[PDB]
Design a binder for this molecule. Structure first.
Ligand SMILES: Cc1cc2nc3c(=O)[nH]c(=O)nc-3n(C[C@H](O)[C@H](O)[C@H](O)COP(=O)(O)O)c2cc1C
Ligand SMILES: Cc1cc2nc3c(=O)[nH]c(=O)nc-3n(C[C@H](O)[C@H](O)[C@H](O)COP(=O)(O)O)c2cc1C
Ligand SMILES: [Ca+2]
Lengths: 176, 175
C-alpha cells in the first residue's frame, strides 16, 4: 500500500490499451483495487460496482472448477498463471477469457498485489493464437513499465508469455 | 513536426523494450534520426555510427529485392508494411529481421517520419510465431503511446499486426 507504488501502477493502468486489474493480497478476501477502462469495457461494469470487491463476480454457477482450483493455488504460492475462464458480462452475455495472473510487490514469499489481465477469446477470427500472443506482448510491456519485469528480462518474459498464451489458446480451440 | 512532439517520441523510444527506429521522410536520402538501445544492441552499432545514414547499411548486395520494392512503395504511399529482411550486424553476423514500418506525423500519404521496429528471427526457440506476434503486441502499445494508432483502433491493430507477423514467420520458416 506504499503510496508511490500504488499511483505508479494506477497511471500505467489508466493509459494502457489492455484490460488490467489489481487485487489486494493483504486480505484473504482479495478485493479488487484497480480496474482500467479496457477491463470495464469487456465486462460491462462500472469502476464502482467492482472496486473493493473480489473478481469472481464475472463467473456464474460453477463451470471453471479446475481453473478456480489452479488460480487459488497460484495466488497462495505467489506464482504466475495463465488460464482460460468462462465468464459473463454484466448484461449476461457469455465470453471466454484468457486470464494472465502476475504477482506484484512485496517479496516472493508474499507479493502485495496480484495483477490480472484478460484477453477476450472468440473475437479474432482465424487468428486467436496470434492475437493472444499479441496481448501477452502488450501485457509484458506494461509489466516492465510497472517495474515487475526487469528491463534486461522483458524480451525473455515476452517470449515466454506469448508462447504460453498461444499454447493455451490451441488447447481451448481443440477442446470444442 | 514540432520539437515538443519529437521529444515525446524520443522518450518513448528511449524506454521501449522493443527495437525502434525513426527515419526522416523530408529528404529523399531518408536518414535515420532515432535509434533506440534495443536496436543498437541487435545491430552492434552506436548512435554516432548510424544516425544520418539510410537504414539499408544493414543490407548487402542486391539482397531482399522483392522486400525492398515493397518497402519503397509503402514509403512512397505512406502505408504500413511488414516484411522480412536479411541483415548483418556491425561485425558481419547475418540475421533475419521481421521489420514493421509505420508512418508517423505529417499528413496521410506524406508522413513526416517513418517508424521501424525490428524483430530478430531465429532467437525464440520453438515459439517463433508467438514471439513475433508478441513483438507486434508490444510494438502496438508503443504506437498507441506516440499517438499514431487511434485509441479505438488499438485492439484491432494489435490483432492485425500479430496476425501479419505470424504469417510472415510461417512463410520465412518455409524457406
Ligand atoms: C488479479 C486478479 C484478476 C482476476 N480476474 C478474474 C477475471 O477476470 N475473471 C474471473 O472469472 N476470475 C478472475 N480472478 C479470479 C477470482 O477473483 C478468484 O480469485 C478465483 O476465481 C478463485 O476462485 P475462488 O476463490 O472463488 O474459489 C482474478 C483474480 C485475480 C487475483
Ligand atoms: C523506419 C525505417 C526502418 C528501416 N529499418 C530497416 C532495417 O532494420 N533493416 C533493413 O534492411 N532495412 C530497413 N529499412 C529499409 C531501408 O531503409 C530501405 O527503405 C529499404 O532497403 C528499401 O529501399 P532501397 O531498395 O532503396 O534500399 C528501414 C526503413 C525505414 C523507413
Ligand atoms: Ca516506451
Amino acid at each position: 500500500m506504499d503510496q508511490k507504488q500504488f499511483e505508479k501502477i494506477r497511471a500505467v493502468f489508466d493509459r494502457s490499451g489492455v484490460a488490467l486489474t489489481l487485487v489486494d493480497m493483504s486480505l484473504p478476501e482479495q478485493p479488487l483495487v484497480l480496474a482500467n477502462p479496457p477491463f470495464l469495457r469487456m465486462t460491462g461494469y462500472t469502476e464502482d460496482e467492482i472496486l473493493g470487491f473480489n473478481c469472481r463476480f464475472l463467473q456464474r454457477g460453477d463451470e471453471n472448477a479446475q481453473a478456480r482450483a489452479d488460480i487459488r493455488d497460484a495466488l497462495k504460492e505467489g506464482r504466475e498463471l495463465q488460464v482460460v475462464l468462462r465468464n459473463y458480462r454484466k448484461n449476461g452475455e457469455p465470453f471466454d477469457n484468457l486470464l494472465f495472473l502476475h504477482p506484484v510487490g512485496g517479496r516472493p514469499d508474499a507479493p502485495d498485489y496480484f495483477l490480472g489481465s484478460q484477453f477476450e477469446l472468440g473475437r479474432s477470427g482465424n487468428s486467436e493464437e496470434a492475437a493472444a500472443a499479441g496481448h501477452a506482448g502488450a501485457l509484458t510491456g506494461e509489466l516492465a513499465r510497472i517495474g515487475t519485469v526487469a528491463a534486461r528480462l522483458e524480451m525473455d518474459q515476452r517470449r515466454h508469455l506469448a508462447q504460453a498464451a498461444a499454447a493455451l489458446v490451441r488447447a481451448w480451440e481443440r477442446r470444442g
